[PDB]
Amino acid sequence: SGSPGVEQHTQAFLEALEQGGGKPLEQLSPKDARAVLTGAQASVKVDLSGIEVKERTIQANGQSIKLQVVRPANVKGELPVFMFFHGGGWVLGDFPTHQRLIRDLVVGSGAVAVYVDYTPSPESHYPTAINQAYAATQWVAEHGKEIGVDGKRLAVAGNSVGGNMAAVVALKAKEAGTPALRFQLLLHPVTDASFETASYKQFADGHFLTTGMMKWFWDNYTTDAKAREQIYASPLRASSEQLKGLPPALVQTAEFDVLRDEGEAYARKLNAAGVTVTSVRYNGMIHDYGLLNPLSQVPAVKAAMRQAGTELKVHLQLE
Amino acid sequence: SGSPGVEQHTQAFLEALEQGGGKPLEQLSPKDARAVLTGAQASVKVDLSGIEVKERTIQANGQSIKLQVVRPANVKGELPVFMFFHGGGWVLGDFPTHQRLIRDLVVGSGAVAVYVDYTPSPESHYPTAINQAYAATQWVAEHGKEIGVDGKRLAVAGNSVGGNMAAVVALKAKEAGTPALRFQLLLHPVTDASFETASYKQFADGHFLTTGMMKWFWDNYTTDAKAREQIYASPLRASSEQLKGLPPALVQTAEFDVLRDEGEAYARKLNAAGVTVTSVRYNGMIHDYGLLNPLSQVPAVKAAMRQAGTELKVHLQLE
Numbered sequence: 001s002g003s004p005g006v007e008q009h010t011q012a013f014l015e016a017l018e019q020g021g022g023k024p025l026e027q028l029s030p031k032d033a034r035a036v037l038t039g040a041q042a043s044v045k046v047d048l049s050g051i052e053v054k055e056r057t058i059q060a061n062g063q064s065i066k067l068q069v070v071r072p073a074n075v076k077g078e079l080p081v082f083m084f085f086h087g088g089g090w091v092l093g094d095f096p097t098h099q100r101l102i103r104d105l106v107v108g109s110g111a112v113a114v115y116v117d118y119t120p121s122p123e124s125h126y127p128t129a130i131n132q133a134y135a136a137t138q139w140v141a142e143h144g145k146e147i148g149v150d151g152k153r154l155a156v157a158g159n160s161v162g163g164n165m166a167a168v169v170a171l172k173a174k175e176a177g178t179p180a181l182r183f184q185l186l187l188h189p190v191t192d193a194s195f196e197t198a199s200y201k202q203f204a205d206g207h208f209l210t211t212g213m214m215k216w217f218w219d220n221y222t223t224d225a226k227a228r229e230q231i232y233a234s235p236l237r238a239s240s241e242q243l244k245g246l247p248p249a250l251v252q253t254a255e256f257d258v259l260r261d262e263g264e265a266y267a268r269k270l271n272a273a274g275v276t277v278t279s280v281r282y283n284g285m286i287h288d289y290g291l292l293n294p295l296s297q298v299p300a301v302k303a304a305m306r307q308a309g310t311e312l313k314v315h316l317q318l319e
Numbered sequence: 320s321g322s323p324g325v326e327q328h329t330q331a332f333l334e335a336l337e338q339g340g341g342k343p344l345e346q347l348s349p350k351d352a353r354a355v356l357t358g359a360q361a362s363v364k365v366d367l368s369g370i371e372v373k374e375r376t377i378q379a380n381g382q383s384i385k386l387q388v389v390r391p392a393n394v395k396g397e398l399p400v401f402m403f404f405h406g407g408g409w410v411l412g413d414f415p416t417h418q419r420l421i422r423d424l425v426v427g428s429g430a431v432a433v434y435v436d437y438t439p440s441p442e443s444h445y446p447t448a449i450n451q452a453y454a455a456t457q458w459v460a461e462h463g464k465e466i467g468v469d470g471k472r473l474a475v476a477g478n479s480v481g482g483n484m485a486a487v488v489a490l491k492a493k494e495a496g497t498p499a500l501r502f503q504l505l506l507h508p509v510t511d512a513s514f515e516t517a518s519y520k521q522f523a524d525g526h527f528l529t530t531g532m533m534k535w536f537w538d539n540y541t542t543d544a545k546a547r548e549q550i551y552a553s554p555l556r557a558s559s560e561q562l563k564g565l566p567p568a569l570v571q572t573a574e575f576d577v578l579r580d581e582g583e584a585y586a587r588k589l590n591a592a593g594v595t596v597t598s599v600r601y602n603g604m605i606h607d608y609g610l611l612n613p614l615s616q617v618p619a620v621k622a623a624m625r626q627a628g629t630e631l632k633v634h635l636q637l638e
Contacts, residue, residue: 310625
């Protein structure tokens with residue numbers, strides 16, 4: 001269905017989904033909802049070349065955590081590294097659904113991605129996944145040599161709830177005083193457990209990610225209102241003092257996205273706190289433009305991916 | 320003065336200008352206004368390395384036109400090429416005021432820039448400069464070998480009224496059936512001789528480029544209302560049919576810019592006409608963020624420049 005101004009291929013994609021019909025995602029079991037993303041991502045021929053992928057299980061902060069290490073192919077030596085936190089509304093997502101996005105970031109940056117297999121919701125609730133995400137980030141900083149990376153040159157990155165996770169891991173690293181981070185890449189992040197922004201109102205339906213989906217995602221994550229008010233759930237609620245000293249950020253938002261305004265608002269809060277921020281709204285785009293494989297060849301998406309990889313590279317250089 | 324959300328260094332810049340005082344630009348003679356930009360650009364140490372600059376005067380469509388050819392240094396062979404049309408509101412601007420911006424685009428793309436020294440206003444009026452701009456573009460396509468470029472791989476680029484000029488040259492090339500263009504790079508372009516968009520209302524003052532300046536710029540360009548209604552002055556007025564077949568575009572706009580809305584509106588019109596467009600709003604930025612030397616080290620500006628160079632490069636490749 002979409003709106004005037006939606007990029008042409010994206011609009012055609014939305015119309016194709018509308019014609020395909022199907023139950024609202026939030027009316028499905030977590031298992032069936034996961035299968036929607038799995039099936040849709042698998043339905044598209046995509047370039048996954050130029051990477052080498054290796055699983056690694058680590059012992060960190062009291063639990064076993066599974067990683068996927070994604071390295072630029074045919075490259076020798078220690079490389080700088082970014083943690084990658086996947087989206088999917090906490091309920092959906094995993095490594096293979098996100099592999100093309102991760103691949104594009106790795107190939108475009110020359111840096112190694114460390115995907116963290118955090119526990120999904122509702123199997124776990126806040127703050128289980130963010131504690132895993134932080135534990136893995138500290139692990140990479142300390143033990144990077146074991147997986148062929150320079151852990152002292154370390155960024156965090158993610159899409160959607162993964163952008164939430166990246167932002168929150170940066171906050172947790174500030175709180176803990178470790179590890180040092182070069183950069184945070186937030187691709188259309190969730191930043192606030194509230195649903196009254198102008199973008200939430202304007203794009204409630206018809207633009208892939210719906211308000212109904214967002215409320216369901218948040219409900220599966222946690223129904224504890226006190227938890228939702230914590231900065232580690234809703235980082236937009238942080239004060240300037242709480243944000244001071246965070247690493248430089250690139251925040252990409254999508255024009256036609258309920259989460260657009262809270263993402264841009266978080267960028268403004270970082271800027272007001274003296275954090276270096278580049279905040280770029282990709283016009284014509286819907287939420288998860290960098291994830292969805294049917295959109296991966298849209299020229300604006302390719303440009304967004306080129307930028308994301310380049311900014312990772314710029315911030316992960318030697319000295 | 321600025322607004323909540325203006326990027327921190329940009330805000331400090333605006334405040335410094337406010338404290339410096341001085342007459343409104345539009346109350347100055349063209350000569351004195353030109354000197355404001357010349358002096359301000361010269362007051363900042365900037366990196367101009369990595370280029371070789373050579374002047375060339377050409378005979379094209381009945382007149383002598385001066386070019387500055389800006390080539391990546393230490394590179395052999397034919398290179399692809401982009402025309403560069405400078406901003407300055409038609410009254411101001413020239414090569415040296417714009418040299419750092421041009422340099423960044425050349426170094427970041429690996430392509431040669433051809434700066435066109437169009438006749439300023441009010442010394443000339445519409446359509447003198449755009450006819451010169453087009454003549455030079457056709458010349459480069461035909462005679463590129465003479466200046467070390469592959470004229471068959473040709474883009475147009477410009478900031479502000481230079482973005483207007485690039486967009487209009489692309490339209491003139493469609494009208495003439497020549498030359499073929501790979502790409503149009505529009506950095507915060509002027510697209511419409513009207514002053515009633517929401518951004519014009521919101522950012523009328525306090526954000527460097529004022530509504531008063533824009534009206535003065537347009538008045539110096541042409542006071543002919545019929546001329547202003549032509550698509551070669553106000554390309555936003557073009558129909559979908561008139562825009563069909565134009566080359567792929569990157570349109571960067573600035574959040575805090577009176578011209579923001581008409582730039583984004585032009586991107587939407589291109590998209591509606593089936594033209595490939597990437598439209599990106601750089602949040603926190605003011606107009607001419609890529610031109611103004613005091614802002615050239617602002618991290619978001621560096622990111623915008625990296626993107627602009629990269630997108631030129633991507634679109635100017637072989638085959």
